[PDB]
Amino acid sequence: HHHHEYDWRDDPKVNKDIEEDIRDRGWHPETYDFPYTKKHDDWVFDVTMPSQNYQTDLTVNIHPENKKMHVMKQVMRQSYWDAEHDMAHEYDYESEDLDFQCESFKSQHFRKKGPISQYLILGLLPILYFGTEFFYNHYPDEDYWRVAHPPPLDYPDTDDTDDTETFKDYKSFTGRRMVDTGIVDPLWYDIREGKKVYYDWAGVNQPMEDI
Amino acid sequence: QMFVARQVVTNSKGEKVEVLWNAQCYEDIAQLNVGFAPVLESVDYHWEIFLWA
Amino acid sequence: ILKVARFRVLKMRPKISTSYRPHGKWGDFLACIIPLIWCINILTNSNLIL
Amino acid sequence: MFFELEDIKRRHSLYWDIYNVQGWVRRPDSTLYNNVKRGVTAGVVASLVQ
Amino acid sequence: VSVNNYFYYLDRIKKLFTYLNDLRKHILKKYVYTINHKRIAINYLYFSMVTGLSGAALATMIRLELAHPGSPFFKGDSLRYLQVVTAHGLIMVFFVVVPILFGGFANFLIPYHVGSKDVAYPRLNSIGFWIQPCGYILLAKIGFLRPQFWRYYDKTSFSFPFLEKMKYNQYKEYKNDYLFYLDFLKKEITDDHSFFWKARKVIKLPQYSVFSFVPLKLMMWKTMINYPESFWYAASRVVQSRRKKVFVTKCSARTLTTAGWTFITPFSSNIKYTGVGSQDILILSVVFAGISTTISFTNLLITRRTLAMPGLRHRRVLMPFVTISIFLTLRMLATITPVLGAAVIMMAFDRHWQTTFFEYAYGGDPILSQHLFWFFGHPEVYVLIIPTFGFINMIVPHNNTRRVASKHHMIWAIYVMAYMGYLVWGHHMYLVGLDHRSRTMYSTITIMISMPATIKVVNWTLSLVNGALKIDLPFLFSMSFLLLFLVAGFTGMWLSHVSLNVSMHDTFYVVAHFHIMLSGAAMTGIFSGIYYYFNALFGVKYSRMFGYMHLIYYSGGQWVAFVPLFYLGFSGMPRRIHDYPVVFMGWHSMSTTGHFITLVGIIFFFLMMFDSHIERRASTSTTLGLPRWYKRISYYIFKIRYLQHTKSKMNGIPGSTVRLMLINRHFVEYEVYE
Amino acid sequence: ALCIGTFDIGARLATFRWLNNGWQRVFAGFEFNFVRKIPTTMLAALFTAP
Amino acid sequence: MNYSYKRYWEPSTAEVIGLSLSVNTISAALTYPIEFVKVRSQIRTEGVGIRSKNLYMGINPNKVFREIHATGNGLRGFYQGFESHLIGRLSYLFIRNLTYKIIYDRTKPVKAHNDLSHREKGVIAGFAGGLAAFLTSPADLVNTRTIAEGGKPKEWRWGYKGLMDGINKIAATEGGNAALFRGSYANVLRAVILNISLTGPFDYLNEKIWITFGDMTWNKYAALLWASFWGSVATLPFDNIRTRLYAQNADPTKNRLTYSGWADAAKKLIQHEGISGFYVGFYAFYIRTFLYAWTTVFITDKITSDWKRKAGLKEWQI
């Protein structure tokens, strides 16, 4: 039972640093009782339907299009947990508290929503987990997610990458004729100095240096 | 959500009895609002649906 | 699709469904004629190929 | 070196992969001046008509 | 009087520590040690979200590999691709759909719908939930794990010399025989307590007779004499040489693979073909999954038979259709779990004891293994699909505020489908050479499973008509489920055509069939059930905007991802190949695009959960306490309360005249005035 | 229109091109990994929003 | 990874002094109103703390900015302390860079690709920052009080029209030059923590992103965002306590809370505000740190890359 004293720092009316949630205009979950037993919606008239009797009043016509503005009724704010009180309500005394269910219905365990930042993880779970399975674990391998760079001129060996030979294969007689056939696309690089420079239309990045 | 309607009738005993048409759910107690306020919101979330077994 | 999407929402002539129980007996037999025709066609074509 | 944070630049050895044409490869025509020119042209024409 | 305590910050810190300890105890007693079925179901749902993300990541790996030919993802690692495919299939069947449905929905709704205080075995419920994670981990990480854990550039020759103990076998001779030991010490030392690595390079330096090729990390024994780790650091990634070629072998252990989620023999049941490792992991994990399923269906079926409410002991027509479907699937799992367990136990015995259960040379037959697995197999898929029928049969009448078309006939249709599930197991074995009598029996009993499903379709369609429709978010998911189930059902019926199945067995046509059935229809029904019980699951109203985004991206993504798979199946694309003819790359790319659309939908679903828990608004049922308008007086009461509620909502919003005035006079930017 | 197509629409287009020029397509298929362009387009829209 | 450093070209003492002074002046001019808002936010909760709940915890930087602009001075009213903040910032940077360059040149490794470890560089930077913050404590004290006198009653305002004016007023009213170093220890701690909480995380995430994604261009900026976040987390409590000690008037009557030192300030912050009170103005401080670091790193990278290209370093050495 009971409650602590008054502190103006906790009062939104006095402490202007407390930002007001306009979606909680008429709802104060800290005053909620469990189970909820307070009526907050009853008959409302004189909004568009007058509360008086003009059914057979030939001098009065009802125009609901002229509905006067009223205070907006926000959707009901869910209850917020009172941690300590909750941790004092569901607390168990070992070997001195009987294993029984009380007669009062207030012993029911009600679910009151808590902090929100935890669900931020739930917001980013499909991203982070995927990163955890592709970036942190580097699956399938290290070089898949890296930006693609071709190997340099004749690296790591002329067997895997016979670029120089390919150059000759495109500068020899036969190679030229092959390009004339149109079944072989033109050469996609040039050997300048000891470096291989890809043409702009090739569509690849330049090879990295041998640092 | 407690009672959708109220009614006053007279039985064969001449008594002015009260009948409260409750709010129902379609086969799902999960979809039933187990509340004790004259409202329409589902404010109460009971962890133990059958508290006293 | 037309009847449900154009005349079955709350604002467009809904129906007061006063029906305690389903009372269908041979509706399954009548409706399963179309699957029966499909089975006949599949069996005939498959056997003729086989 | 200059302030609290040092943007350490690290040299790295060569790496390469099997394929080269399905990742991030900056286009040659995508320069600052060219992008600004084309975007400004399209934007001013569309804005004038709008 | 005035109190000047020197430790006020310290009083605050003491209160913080007390709060943290009390909160730890509260969390342990409420979410870890609890037997509460609702909390256990919520934990099941979150664990299932994690496992569904794992399965989606595995499917993403598969689709990235299949995006275009040439093995762009695994780079020729066919064994790794097969392991990934098997893990995806197994954890999607046994650790996403089954956990979601049974764990979450059963443990949440059976106490509700049947009307029982918790379950018959709360201990068994907790046990099943907390034994799920080990099987999930074992079945989901076989794509990352194999006994050949080292990569092709890992110089095993740097550390494996430290493994060979046959090098010191000579000294083992004289440990119990000192007689000649002194003579053994008079020999010539060649490689005694020393390691020599042969030249790995051609060095032309005649000044040096011998060149030391000791690994660079093994030179200073001091640094290694106090390090409590194996010598693998000297062999793990110590060379820059790489071979970025598809044809090079990155495993050198061709046997280290798996045989798909359908264990095919003798491939599964022989170390000669599937080496020790992932295959054994899968077999024993299936044993464990069978044990967990046994616990689950025991706990759930004893509850309804014993702890049911007095009026719903035997009248299954009164329970919600999801509960009817769950109980039917639990009985089906009760029947098939012993068969599956026997099959996998026989596979394990054949692998590690050479019992030759499936070796034809001396009596065995792999066809027996196929028969056992598929006897379990098809009833498993019918277990997976049926509860979604319950989800739609609950959601559609709720929003339409009318009775379902024929609940009795739908129940008998799903029950006869369950009956036929035990005589159609052979339609997966048309080509294995079964006798024509059995093959015809399987075909004729399979084609007649279209009879019960069409009853379900007709009943859903007739439930959609002649009622007061209240469009919600679960309803749209129900429509998506119906649309997806229309396609997969008729394609599967086509798969019972014998000649077509001959031309479509083990094909992406079958893949698209059971993915439109499972990935599309079953997961869409699961999502619809989640939205339908969102308040019951979380206590707050869900987020319409991100929910609609998830609905749009997830539902269409299934079509975009699995219609091209139909087109590929008609083109002759065999399953379980990471490389294919280049005439399939367009539709494979379209399928991967659809999969990424589905991933965006999943992102939107997690975002909608996050935004709903930001919102923190109490949910109001659309029925307003009158689910059924059995009487015109009930209709009048609902209409009055609905008008009052709408009037209450429309406060703070200006009237029609004011809004029209503002809209008409919005524009205020003029040049010349009077 | 000149002011808004030079500094707003043109800036949007220039930032989008500067951020999304290098995402190459697939030769005979479709750009399956379009999710890589979502954080990039979000950054482009945020940068040119004000 | 210690082989991977790239120190082929190292700027001279004059070069580092000039570049640091110029680029840091530009950054401080760009991002001073953010620090004005941050100091303003830390003062309006000097004894109240965070009293809102859930997503509303903290003080809205946009709300503070709107109020300060509605004061009537406009954007020009955010640089009152910038008149004195710039001199203090530049003096701190000059002293810190001199000490850092001297200690580094007396201890740097011989090989151009070998650099001191993050721990050694953190020790050097912490010593340099502590020394410079102790030497620039009067300037930082004058700067903070100029910002502080906007959210305080007319009786509590010091009324400093500049930097030398503030120095003279403090040396006269509060006893002497010894009163110029109020909060000097707090400033020293703030500089020490700030000098060690950025390079570490920045290099961490930059190298890990490179390993994951190769030599892309967003790697350094994402790492800078991460480093700014972690530096703000590590430094904000010390900066908050420094602001509290700077804004504490000599007269005990003109103080919402009276502190006898850094420990007393921390104790009272924990007692009245709580643990969450140290991170008031986190968004403003983090945005300021990120923008300052981005401007400085970008301009320094451009200038130093141009100088390396002029000097003749190979493109992989730049």
Ligand code: HEA
């Ligand atoms: C939950 C999953 C699920 C469901 C419900 C089904 C349902 C059906 N399945 Fe199948 N199936 C699988 C999951 C499922 N299946 C899996 C996973 C495999 C492969 C296992 C593996 O090998 O890996 C498989 C394999 C499989 C094969 C083997 C293909 C091959 O390998 O050769 C065959 C063929 O007989 C088949 C048939 C059927 C039939 C006839 C139905 C019927 O029950 C469906 C009938 C339903 C309808 C008929 C309703 C549709 C209604 C209509 C009115 C359609 C008409 C509409 C239009 C034409 C617009 N299935």
Ligand code: HEA
């Ligand atoms: C129900 C099971 C299930 C599900 C959902 C899926 C989903 C998907 N499947 Fe698969 N699949 C199988 C069962 C499933 N699959 C089986 C049994 C096999 C055969 C194994 C074999 O061939 O041996 C198979 C094989 C298979 C292959 C074969 C590869 C090959 O043979 O070449 C491919 C490749 O295209 C593929 C693709 C996909 C894709 C792109 C999805 C996408 O739909 C993925 C979308 C992601 C989700 C659907 C997860 C939902 C996310 C959540 C986090 C849910 C959790 C949240 C809650 C609801 C609480 N699947």
Ligand SMILES: CCCCCCCCCCCCCCCCCC(=O)OC[C@H](COP(=O)([O-])OCC[N+](C)(C)C)OC(=O)CCCCCCCCCCCCCCCCC
């Ligand atoms: C220890 C605690 C946890 C640590 C977790 C660490 C990771 C956290 C999660 C990731 C954060 C975001 C990082 C984005 C960086 C993007 C940079 C970039 O250009 O990337 C290019 C890459 C690759 O683009 P690509 O398609 O051109 O390259 C394919 C590979 N080659 C080059 C061979 C053709 O794209 C992405 O990474 C897209 C990221 C989108 C946003 C999602 C982030 C997670 C991504 C996981 C893998 C991809 C799954 C896609 C579907 C996801 C659905 C959920």
Ligand SMILES: CCCCCCCCCCCCCCCCCC(=O)OC[C@H](COP(=O)([O-])OCC[N+](C)(C)C)OC(=O)CCCCCCCCCCCCCCCCC
């Ligand atoms: C992101 C910006 C995108 C801009 C795209 C469009 C660009 C082209 C159009 C630009 C129009 C605006 C600039 C006009 C410049 C010329 C006028 C001028 O400078 O006059 C002298 C102005 C006059 O200011 P003034 O306020 O005295 O104006 C005089 C009129 N009264 C007094 C009545 C209000 O002087 C200054 O601005 C002095 C300060 C220098 C600039 C400071 C910039 C600060 C930027 C924000 C920093 C962060 C703040 C906190 C944010 C929230 C917390 C994190």
Ligand SMILES: [Cu+2]
């Ligand atoms: Cu089957």
